Write a protein that binds this DNA or RNA. Structure first.
Ligand SMILES: OC[C@H]1O[C@@](CO)(O[C@H]2O[C@H](CO)[C@@H](O)[C@H](O)[C@H]2O)[C@@H](O)[C@@H]1O
Lengths: 415, 553
DNA sequence: TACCCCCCCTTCGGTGCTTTGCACCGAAGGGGGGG
C-alpha cells in the first residue's frame, strides 16, 4: 500500500542499452541463485525481447567477505535518469564528515527492496543473465522495486531513511551520517571501541525497522589521517647537466600550476653543449631562483576551490615499485587534492589489482570529501582493464572511466 | 488441441505509421508459384485474406531453395523494420562443441516451421499486409495479412526464440538429468541415461513441444552419430568441423581471396597453425571485387602451408570440468600467433589464432599480452573460467617489461615453455645518463608550406651534422635527427631531444613498425650496448638544444 | 532487392594529443560460420 514516486529520464534520452559481458562460472552460479530468490519475493520479474533496454550485471565479494553480492552497472541509467537535485530529493553533503577521526561504511542497500518502483520506469532496469557456452539464450529480468546501485533509490528512500535514523541522531548529535548510493557513512570523534559500539547500535536500530552483502559488515576509515602528495624539487649539493635538465623540465611544467616560477637563471647554466654527466656549479643567481621556486611550491595554488556544479576528474600515474600517484581536479592545473599510494594489494605482482584498489580508494575519498565520484583517466589499455577489473572490484558503486596512454617524459609527481 | 502461445506485445516507433511500398514487377514463373503458397497459408490459418480496410502494403518476391526444385516465399519488410520498435536480442553468442561435456546418449532435433507456429500480435498484424499480382496486374490480385511471425521481420527471431525458451523452461527444470542446448529452433539434447530411458525423455520433449503447437519432423530428427550440429560433427568421444572446401582456382578475384581467408579463419578453430597474413595482404587495397590478383611468392607459400595442415583430418575432444584448462601459445612471425586449449596433452579442446596488428608501433610482448586477453575471454565464454597459460617468454623478460612499462599490465597464472621462437625485449634504454659516452643534442624541423626540412645534431666533443630533407614533417625530422645520432655514435650514447612524439614511441620499446624510419631506428637501437634518451623543453635556450635548434631551423 | 546472432580483416571518418600530423578506435562492409 505504498505509492510510487514517479520517475522520468532526461528529455532527449532513451534508456540504457548495454550488452552483457561474459561471466565466469562462479559469478553466473551466484547470480542465478540470487535472481531465483529475488523472483520468488517479487523484487524482479522475467521479461522478453520486446523490452529494448539492457544493463550489465555481475557479482562481487566485498573485502574479507565470502558471500557473493549482486552488482548491476547502472552507470548508463544513472546518467540518463532525471537529476533528483532538481526534484529537491537531493542528499546534502556534510563538510564535517572528513574531519571525523573514524568513519564506518555500512551497506544499507538491502533496505531499498522494500519500496516499489514506478511501473513505467521498470522497463529501464532490464538486465540479462548469460549462460556458459551459450547453452541458453539470455534470460531477461527487470526490477519491481528500488534496485541497488541506482541513483534514484537512495533519493526516493531518503524520506523513510531520515525517519529511521532520527532517534539515533538525536541521542548522538555529535555523529555525522551521510548517504551515498547503497552506503551509509557514519563519522565520530569517539574512541574506537565507543565508535564501534555506536555503529552496532545503529545496526540493531536498523533491525527495529527491519522487524517493523548484508548489513552486519562495516569498513573503517580515518579521514583525519589522510595526506597529500605535493610537487617537490630534489635537494642536491652537486648537480649534473642531466639533473638540471630534468629540473628545468619539471619546473617549466610546474609553471602551468604555479605561474610565478622562473627557469631563466637555471636555463643559462645549460648554455653550452656539455656531457650529461658533467658536474656544474650553480651561479649565485640560480641558487636563489631555485630557492625562490621551492617556496612558491610550498604555498597553495591561487583560486583553486571546489565547485559543486562541476564534475570531478581523477588522473593516476604508475610510478613503479607498487607506487601510484593521483590528482583530483575540476579544471586543469587547479588540483583539489594530490596523493600517493604504495604497498597495496597486488604490489609487485599484479598491476591491474593495484590500479583497481587505487580507483576504489580515490572514489571513497572523493565521496567522503565532496560527496562525488570522479571520472577516472586510467593509465592502461581498454582491453587489459576490461578483461580483469571485475575480478578485483570490491565496491557497490562503479565510477566513470576513460583510458589514456601518457609516457612520463618528466617525472612530475614522484622522484 | 494445442495450448495457445501467448502473444508478444509489439509496437511501431512513436509517431511512425505502417509501411506503404506497393510491389515491384514480377516474372510470371514467380507470380505463379507464389499464389499456390498463399492458399496453403490461408488454409492452415497462417494468413488471413481480408484486405480492403488496410492502407498498408509491403513487397513480396521469391527465389529457389538451394539447389532444389522448390520456390521460396520471402517478404521484404525493411521499411516496416525501420518503423518497428527496437528489440533486445537474447542470442548473446554461439555455442561451441569444446564446451560440451561427454554424454552417453545424445539427440539433435529441430522444430518444424518455427516462425509460422507462433502467433503475431493482433494489433500489429495489419502492418504486415502485402499484395500479390493476380496475373501480371491485369486484374487486382490477392491481399493478405500475417497471423504469425513472418520471415523478413526483424522482430521474428527474437520473439520465436524467447517463446521457444519459455516453453522449454518447465521441461528443463523438471528434468535436471538432461542437458538441452537451444540455438534458435535447433536443439541438442544429451544425457548419461540408458538410451531407452533417453529415447523416452526425447519423446516426452517431443510431445511437450507439440502441446504448444511446435512440431519436430522425423526428417530433422538425428538419432545415430555422427550428429550434425552447428556446423560440426559430434562423435561420442570426439568432435570435428564439417568438411572444408578450398577453391583451388588458378585465377583469383578480390572476392576469391575474401572467401578463401574466410574459410581459413573458420578452419583455425580446430586445425592448428593457420596463417592468413600474406593472403590477407593480397586483399588490402581499393580493388573492386572483380579485379584479379596474382598470388605473391609468400602468399602462395602461406596458402601452401595451409593446405598441408588441412590435408590431415583433425578432431577436438570434449570438456572435463574435473581438469584444469591449459592454453599454450606460439609465435608464428609477422605478428601472427596460434594457440591450443587442452586439458590432457595432445588432445585439443580447440585451437585458434591471433594475428591482429593494433597500433603503428608495437612489440612481441604487447601482442602476446593481447593474445592472452582474447584467449582468456573466449575461454570464459565457453568454459566460464580462465585457463592456465604456457607462454614462449621467460619470467625475467616479462618481469622487466611489466614493471618498467608506464601502463598497468598483467598476465594471469602462467609458466614459461621453451619453444622457439622465444619472445624477448630487443633493447633496453638506460635509466641514467652514461658516463664517458658522447652526448648528442639532436633536433629537426620542417616548413609547413614547403614540406622541406632539416635534421641534425651537435655533440659535446664538437661533432656536428645537418642533413637536408624533402617532402617531410616536423615529426619525421625529429625521428630523423635521432636516427643520425644513432648512426654516427659508438656502442654507448646519450641523446637529448625536445621531441615528445619521438620519445613516446621509442620508450615503449617497439620491435616492429609500420614506418620504415622507425624500423631503422629500432635496428640501430638493437646494435647499441647502451642508450640513454632524454627530453628537454624547446625554446628555453637549453644545452646544445639551443645550438642545434638554430642549425636546423 | 528479406530477418536475427557470433568471428576475422580492411577501410574510413571522427577524435584528441604526438597537434594542423599522427595515432587511436569504432563503425561498416567484405568474407567465414550458425538458425
Ligand atoms: O570500459 C568502458 C566500456 O564500458 C561500457 C560498457 O559497459 O560502458 C560503461 O562504462 C563507461 C565508461 O565509464 C560508461 O560511460 C558507460 O555508461 C558504462 O555503461 C562501454 O560503453 C565502454 O566501452
Amino acid at each position: 500500500p505504498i505509492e510510487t514516486v514517479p520517475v522520468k529520464l532526461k528529455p532527449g534520452m532513451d534508456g540504457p542499452k548495454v550488452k552483457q559481458w561474459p561471466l565466469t562460472e562462479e559469478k553466473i552460479k551466484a547470480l542465478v541463485e540470487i535472481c531465483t530468490e529475488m523472483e520468488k519475493e517479487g523484487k524482479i520479474s522475467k521479461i522478453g525481447p520486446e523490452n529494448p533496454y539492457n544493463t550489465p550485471v555481475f557479482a562481487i565479494k566485498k573485502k574479507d567477505s565470502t558471500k557473493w553480492r549482486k552488482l548491476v552497472d547502472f552507470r548508463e541509467l544513472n546518467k540518463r535518469t532525471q537529476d533528483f537535485w532538481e526534484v529537491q530529493l537531493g542528499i546534502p553533503h556534510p563538510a564535517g564528515l572528513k574531519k571525523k577521526k573514524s568513519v564506518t561504511v555500512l551497506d544499507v542497500g538491502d533496505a531499498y527492496f522494500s519500496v516499489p518502483l514506478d511501473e513505467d520506469f521498470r522497463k529501464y532496469t532490464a538486465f540479462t543473465i548469460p549462460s556458459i557456452n551459450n547453452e541458453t539464450p539470455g534470460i531477461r529480468y527487470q526490477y519491481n522495486v528500488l534496485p541497488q546501485g541506482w541513483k534514484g533509490s537512495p533519493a526516493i528512500f531518503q524520506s523513510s531513511m531520515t525517519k529511521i535514523l532520527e532517534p539515533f541522531k538525536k541521542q548522538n548529535p555529535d555523529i555525522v551520517i551521510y548517504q551515498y548510493m547503497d552506503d551509509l557513512y557514519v563519522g565520530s570523534d569517539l574512541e574506537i571501541g565507543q565508535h564501534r559500539t555506536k555503529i552496532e547500535e545503529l545496526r540493531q536500530h536498523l533491525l527495529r525497522w527491519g522487524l517493523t552483502p548484508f548489513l552486519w559488515m562495516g569498513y573503517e576509515l580515518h579521514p583525519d589521517k589522510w595526506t597529500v602528495q605535493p610537487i617537490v624539487l630534489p635537494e642536491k649539493d652537486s648537480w649534473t647537466v642531466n639533473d638540471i635538465q630534468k629540473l628545468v623540465g619539471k619546473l617549466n611544467w610546474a609553471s602551468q600550476i604555479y605561474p610565478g616560477i622562473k627557469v631563466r637563471q637555471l636555463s643559462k647554466l645549460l648554455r653550452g653543449t656539455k656531457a650529461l654527466t658533467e658536474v656544474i656549479p650553480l651561479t649565485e643567481e640560480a641558487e636563489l631562483e631555485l630557492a625562490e621556486n621551492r617556496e612558491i611550491l610550498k604555498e597553495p595554488v591561487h583560486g583553486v576551490y571546489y565547485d559543486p556544479s562541476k564534475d570531478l576528474i581523477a588522473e593516476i600515474q604508475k610510478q613503479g615499485q607498487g607506487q601510484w600517484t593521483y590528482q583530483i581536479y575540476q579544471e586543469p592545473f587547479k588540483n583539489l587534492k594530490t596523493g600517493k599510494y604504495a604497498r597495496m594489494r597486488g604490489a609487485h605482482t599484479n598491476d591491474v589489482k593495484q590500479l583497481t584498489e587505487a580507483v576504489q580508494k580515490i572514489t571513497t575519498e572523493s565521496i567522503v570529501i565532496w560527496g562525488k565520484t570522479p571520472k577516472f583517466k586510467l593509465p592502461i589499455q581498454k582491453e587489459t582493464w576490461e578483461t580483469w577489473w571485475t575480478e578485483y572490484w570490491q565496491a557497490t558503486w562503479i565510477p566513470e572511466w576513460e583510458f589514456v596512454n601518457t609516457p612520463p617524459l618528466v617525472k612530475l609527481w614522484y622522484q | 488441441p494445442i495450448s495457445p502461445i501467448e502473444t508478444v506485445p509489439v509496437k511501431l516507433k512513436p509517431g511512425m505509421d505502417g509501411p506503404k511500398v506497393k510491389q515491384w514487377p514480377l516474372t510470371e514463373e514467380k507470380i505463379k508459384a507464389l499464389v499456390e503458397i498463399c492458399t496453403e497459408m490461408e488454409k492452415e490459418g497462417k494468413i488471413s485474406k481480408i484486405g480492403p480496410e488496410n492502407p498498408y502494403n509491403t513487397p513480396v518476391f521469391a527465389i529457389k531453395k538451394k539447389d532444389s526444385t522448390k520456390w521460396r516465399k520471402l517478404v521484404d519488410f525493411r521499411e516496416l523494420n525501420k518503423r518497428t520498435q527496437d528489440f533486445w536480442e537474447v542470442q548473446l553468442g554461439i555455442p561451441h562443441p569444446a564446451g560440451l561435456k561427454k554424454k552417453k546418449s545424445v539427440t539433435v532435433l529441430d522444430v518444424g516451421d518455427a516462425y509460422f507456429s507462433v502467433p503475431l500480435d493482433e494489433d500489429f498484424r495489419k502492418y504486415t499486409a502485402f499484395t500479390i499480382p493476380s496475373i501480371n496486374n491485369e486484374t487486382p490480385g490477392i491481399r493478405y495479412q500475417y497471423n504469425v511471425l513472418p520471415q523478413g521481420w526483424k522482430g521474428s527471431p527474437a520473439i520465436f526464440q524467447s517463446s521457444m525458451t519459455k516453453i522449454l523452461e518447465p521441461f528443463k527444470k523438471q528434468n535436471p538429468d538432461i542437458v538441452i542446448y537451444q540455438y534458435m529452433d535447433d536443439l541438442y539434447v544429451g544425457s548419461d541415461l540408458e538410451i531407452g530411458q533417453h529415447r523416452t525423455k526425447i519423446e516426452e520433449l517431443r510431445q511437450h513441444l507439440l502441446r504448444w503447437g511446435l512440431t519436430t519432423p522425423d526428417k530433422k530428427h538425428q538419432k545415430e552419430p555422427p550428429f550434425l550440429w552447428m556446423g560440426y560433427e559430434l562423435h561420442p568421444d570426439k568432435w570435428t568441423v564439417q568438411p572444408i572446401v578450398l577453391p583451388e582456382k588458378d585465377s583469383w578475384t578480390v572476392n576469391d581471396i575474401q572467401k578463401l581467408v574466410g574459410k581459413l579463419n573458420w578452419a583455425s578453430q580446430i586445425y592448428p597453425g593457420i596463417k592468413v597474413r600474406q593472403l590477407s595482404k593480397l586483399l588490402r587495397g581499393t580493388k573492386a571485387l572483380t579485379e584479379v590478383i596474382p598470388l605473391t611468392e609468400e602468399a602462395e607459400l602461406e596458402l601452401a602451408e595451409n593446405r598441408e595442415i588441412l590435408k590431415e583430418p583433425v578432431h577436438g575432444v570434449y570438456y572435463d570440468p574435473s581438469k584444469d584448462l591449459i592454453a599454450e601459445i606460439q609465435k608464428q612471425g609477422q605478428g601472427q600467433w596460434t594457440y591450443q586449449i587442452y586439458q590432457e596433452p595432445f588432445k585439443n579442446l580447440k585451437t585458434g589464432k591471433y594475428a591482429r596488428m593494433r597500433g603503428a608501433h608495437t612489440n612481441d610482448v604487447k601482442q602476446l599480452t593481447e593474445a592472452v586477453q582474447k584467449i582468456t575471454t573466449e575461454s570464459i565464454v565457453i568454459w566460464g573460467k580462465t585457463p592456465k597459460f604456457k607462454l614462449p617468454i621467460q619470467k625475467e623478460t616479462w618481469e622487466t617489461w611489466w614493471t618498467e612499462y608506464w601502463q598497468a599490465t598483467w598476465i594471469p597464472e602462467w609458466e614459461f615453455v621453451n619453444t622457439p621462437p622465444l619472445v624477448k625485449l630487443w633493447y633496453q634504454l638506460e635509466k641514467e645518463p652514461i658516463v664517458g659516452a658522447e652526448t648528442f643534442y639532436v633536433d629537426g624541423a620542417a616548413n609547413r608550406e614547403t614540406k622541406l626540412g632539416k635534421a641534425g645534431y651537435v655533440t659535446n666533443k664538437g661533432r656536428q651534422k645537418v642533413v637536408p630533407l624533402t617532402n617531410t614533417t616536423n615529426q619525421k625530422t625529429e625521428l630523423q635527427a635521432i636516427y643520425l645520432a644513432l648512426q654516427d655514435s659508438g656502442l654507448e650514447v646519450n641523446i637529448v631531444t625536445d621531441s615528445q612524439y619521438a620519445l613516446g614511441i621509442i620508450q615503449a620499446q617497439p620491435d616492429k613498425s609500420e614506418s620504415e624510419l622507425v624500423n631503422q631506428i629500432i635496428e640501430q637501437l638493437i646494435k647499441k650496448e647502451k642508450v640513454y634518451l632524454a627530453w628537454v623543453p624547446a625554446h628555453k635556450g637549453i644545452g646544445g638544444n639551443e645550438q642545434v635548434d638554430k642549425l636546423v631551423s
